[PDB]
Amino acid sequence: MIIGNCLILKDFSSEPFWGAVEIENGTIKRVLQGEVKVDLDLSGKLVMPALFNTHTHAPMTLLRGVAEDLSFEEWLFSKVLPIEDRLTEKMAYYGTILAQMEMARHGIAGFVDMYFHEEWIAKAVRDFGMRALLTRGLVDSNGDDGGRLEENLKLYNEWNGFEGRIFVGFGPHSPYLCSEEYLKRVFDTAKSLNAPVTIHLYETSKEEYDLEDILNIGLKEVKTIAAHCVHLPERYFGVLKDIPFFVSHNPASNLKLGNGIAPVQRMIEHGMKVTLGTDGAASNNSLNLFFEMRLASLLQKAQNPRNLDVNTCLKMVTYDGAQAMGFKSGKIEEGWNADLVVIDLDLPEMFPVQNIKNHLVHAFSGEVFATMVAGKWIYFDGEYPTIDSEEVKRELARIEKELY
């Protein structure tokens, strides 16, 4: 398939140019320049790499707006846990379909998940069309995890590598909900299976433990997506630079739950790899990485207007996120995955046209025209070609009545 006759943004460091993109077998066969014969004329629009959300809890879309004006401890143990106790397998599936509907409308091609009923979340990802690194949330009590690691292993056995779109990793919740012995066991397991780990790290100010413990259990040799890192001591930035450590910056959630602002600019200046995540819809309420990216840029600029430039922001939301997830995406080049997004330039916020890249970060509404993954359209002009919208909406309505 050849889509083009419009502006093309190869990557975060490139300039938009008029051309087209030829896709075959889910990959980019070649990038054409200028006036060329195309199958799909997208004149008046922009084609760029798709985005990658490095932190979420997909089914939480079913809890959007249920836990407001609460501190973290109240949010989790008072409001969220009781409701999650009623969240069924069927609900996990549809909640994930809903999460993908929302994320796809914002140009997201893949996401990293940490939750339960992960097999049904995987089925939803399979059916909808996105890519994903799925992990099971792990917590324990003196080594007893109620079978959570076992469930994560079942998930791995059945879904890791599925269609080159789904990968499986391990999701220890945090260094405080996981005992030291158990966290070590989780890392040993991930290391043995050469699988990634994702965890909430230094999200709250109460977390004052030393990172040496985790640095000696496998953090150096296991690809780890560390969400938040708001209170991560700067003395560790240097050692985290040359290891497969990816920060997942969740600005909205960090503010909403009163945790603060992560020192992203300093982390980047130290050579650390940083990506963007949304967290769940109950503590952000939106699953929009454009919003997340923009907010991130603004928060760092509070200290210095030169912080987080446009190219760096675009790099984090596309290439860096794909890198964290282990996918050859984030750039429109030959041999790379056909994960692309189309943005309408015929909008007030996209003028002057000579500043398109800047608008993507500081003005763009966030609503894309279309999203493609593996060469397939998962969102196009307000519609979801891979699912039965009416059916899904009816099921979601029944779920709201059933859950609440």
The single residue listed with the structure tokens 């109950």 is 282
Q: Give 364's contacts (C-beta < 8 A, 6+ positions apart).
A: 290, 294, 343, 349, 350
Which residue type sits at 261?
I
Taken in order 264, 265, 270, 271, the sign of the CA dihedral is positive
Binding residue for ligand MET, selected from 55, 57, 64, 331, defined by CB under 6 A: 57
| Residue 118 near Ni ion by CB under 5 A | no
Scan residues 291-350 and list those touching ligand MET (CB under 6 A): none
From ligand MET, Ni ion, none, which one binds at residue 339 (CB under 5 to 8 Å depending on kind)? Answer: none
Decide which of ligand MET, Ni ion, none touches 279; Cβ closer than 5 to 8 Å per partner kind: Ni ion
Q: How many CB atoms lie within 10 A of CB 278?
A: 30
Beta carbon of residue 225, minimum distance to ligand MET (angstroms, whole number): 14
Taking CB under 6 A as the criterion, the residue among 46, 114, 134, 264 binding ligand MET is 114
Say if CB 176 and CB 201 are below 8 A apart.
no
For the chain, count helices (H), then strands (E). Answer: 14, 16
Distance of CA 37 to the CA centre of its chain: 35
**Number of chain residues interacting with ligand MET (CB under 6 A):** 8
DSSP letters spanning 289-330: HHHHHHHHHHHHHTT-TTSS-HHHHHHIIIIIHHHHHT-S-S
Q: Which stretch binds ligand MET (CB under 6 A): 101-109, 114-122, 182-190, 346-354?
A: 114-122
231 is in an annotated binding site: no
- Options 25-33, 111-119, 224-232, 330-338: segment touching ligand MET (CB under 6 A): 111-119
Residue 139 binds which one of ligand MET, Ni ion, none, with CB within 5 to 8 A depending on kind?
ligand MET
Alpha-helical runs (H) found in 230-383: 251-256, 264-269, 289-301, 310-315, 321-325, 356-362
Which residue in 116, 120, 128, 187 binds ligand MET (CB under 6 A)?
116
Q: How many CB atoms are closer than 10 A to CB 27? A: 16
Check binding of 111 to ligand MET (CB under 6 A).
Answer: no
Nearest Cα residue to 150 out of 132, 138, 166 = 138
| Rounded-to-integer distance, Cα 108 and Cα 132, Å | 11
With beta carbons less than 8 A apart as the criterion, state whether 245 and 274 touch: no
Q: Confirm or deny that 279 is annotated as ligand binding.
A: yes
Binding residue (CB under 6 A) for ligand MET from 70, 139, 239, 347: 139
115 binds, among Ni ion, ligand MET, none (CB under 5 to 8 A by kind): ligand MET
Task: Give the residue with the Cβ less far from ligand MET, 66 or 139.
Answer: 139
DSSP-derived secondary structure for 114-146: EESSHHHHHHHHHHH--EEEEEEEE--BTTB-T
84 binds Ni ion, rule: CB under 5 A: no
Q: Is 228 annotated as a binding residue?
A: no
The answer to whether residue 227 forms part of the interface with ligand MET (CB under 6 A) is no
Ligand-binding annotation for 333, yes or no, is: no
Pick the stretch among 21-29, 109-117, 250-258, 380-388 that binds ligand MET (CB under 6 A): 109-117
- In angstroms, how far is CA 2 from the centroid of its own chain? 28
Site string for Ni ion, 258-297 (x = CB under 5 A): ---------------------x------------------
Report the alpha-carbon distance of residue 103 to residue 364 in Å, rounded: 15
Which residues in 148-177 contact ligand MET (CB under 6 A)?
148, 173
- Find the distance separating the first CA and the last CA of the chain, reported in whole Å: 45
Of 84 and 102, CB closest to ligand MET = 84
Binding residues (CB under 5 A) for Ni ion: these are 279
Binding residues (CB under 6 A) for ligand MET: these are 57, 114-116, 137, 139, 148, 173
Annotated binding site for Zn(2+): 55, 57, 200, 279
Annotated binding site: 55, 57, 84, 136, 148, 173, 200, 203, 279
